[PDB]
Symmetry: C2
Subunit: 151 residues, 2 copies
Amino acid sequence: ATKAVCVLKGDGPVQGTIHFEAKGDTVVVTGSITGLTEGDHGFHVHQFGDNTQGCTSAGPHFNPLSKKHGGPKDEERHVGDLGNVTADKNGVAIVDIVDPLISLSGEYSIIGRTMVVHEKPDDLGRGGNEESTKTGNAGSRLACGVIGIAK
Amino acid sequence: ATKAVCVLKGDGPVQGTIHFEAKGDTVVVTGSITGLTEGDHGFHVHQFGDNTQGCTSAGPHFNPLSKKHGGPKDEERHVGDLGNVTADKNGVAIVDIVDPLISLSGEYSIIGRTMVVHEKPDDLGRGGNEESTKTGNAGSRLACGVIGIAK
Ligand SMILES: [Co+2]
Ligand SMILES: [Co+2]
Ligand SMILES: [Cu+2]
Ligand SMILES: [Cu+2]
């Protein structure tokens, strides 16, 4: 499993396609998201690839190491913690992320899991509430999609 | 992964939810599909979990052993060859299968791949034409979805 793809869709105007490519011991995440309100939005990998109930069924962030919510560069982060994507004035966000924690194979494999883009920005668990240590206070799930094997 | 799910959707009335469960050394496929034309419909695992171009981007049938298209009971078949589902008068198909070739882990894993329900009945590789040895003349893909890890 060296390439994956995800199509983000939801109940609103938010849409996008994310590409995953394994490079060395990292995964390179690229793509774009549209129909986003300007600014930052939490971008995470949720535990389940279950769409039965929309984005709600994806569960919490992928967290095999049973840690607290954090930023991508933090040591105490969920594996699904990719931090933030930033939409321009016209509501477009270009995704360009490199991450050593997520993987396309084995234990930390994200294939068959769900990618979610949130309503508010991710505080990286520095909010001071409890919530910050769980969710980053990213709010609602604007769009999501199952990560699948790509050519 | 021992439990998986798939939510089928398309540009039609057809939809459904199919579940996969690892029971013993085999995989049990259950669920239901609606909005189908009465009769048989090809039901296969396509290779790519790429939904960027609808079900089209799912590629051909999952076929790691490089065999020709066949029926679920044939020696010569694609791993993705689950045969046909049958729709009742009221256009409802109930899925209930056990398969010795598909898996939820390892080289035969269908996780991250695409379940597709076709417009026509599957030939089971017995049509007499090339197309038979490929898709069973199952025709267009009415609905599909990427198989994700479930709770
Ligand atoms: Co998190
Ligand atoms: Co086939
Ligand atoms: Cu999240
Ligand atoms: Cu097919």
